[PDB]
Amino acid sequence: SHHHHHHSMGNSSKGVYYRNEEGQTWSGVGRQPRWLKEALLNGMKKEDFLVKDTEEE
DNA sequence: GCGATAATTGATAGG
DNA sequence: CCTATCAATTATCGC
């Protein structure tokens, strides 16, 4: 069984955004910032750094 | 530091 | 596949 945090959860109707080491955040709508592309090719899925208004760090 | 305006970056539309 | 237009993000100016 996949017993981990996964930082995904079931949330969408809230302040959902992507946050990387740069501290920059993406709303998830429209188009992603230049760092999203970099983080994606960095070897990690964008979902791996998906933080919402809830369960936020 | 927060708010608005301008430039760059990403996706969608047209050829 | 390449060029143009619209939408979001990042940076600069104003408060």
Does strand C come within 7 Å of the CB of A51?
A: no
Task: For tokens 């809830």, name the residue.
Answer: A54
Q: Provide the 8-state DSSP code for A25.
A: E
Edge-first strand listing for the sheet containing A16-19: A25-26, A16-19, A50-52
Task: For tokens 């080491």, name the residue.
Answer: A21
Overall number of domains in chain A? 1
Give the long-range contacts of residues A25-34, CB within 8 A, separation 24 or more. A25/A51
Q: Nearest 5 degrees, angle CA A42-CA A55-CA A37?
A: 20
Please give the Cα distance from A57 to A54 (Å, whole number). 9
Does strand C come within 7 Å of the CB of A43?
A: no
Q: Is A32 exposed, middle or buried (0-12, 13-18, 19+ CB in 10 A)?
A: middle
Residue A13 host element (H or E): none
Phi, then psi, of A44 in degrees rounded to 5: -135, 145
The boundaries of the domain holding residue A36 are 1-57
CATH number of the domain encompassing residue A21: 4.10.430.10
Residue A34 host element (H or E): helix A34-41
Task: For tokens 């998906």, name the residue.
Answer: A50
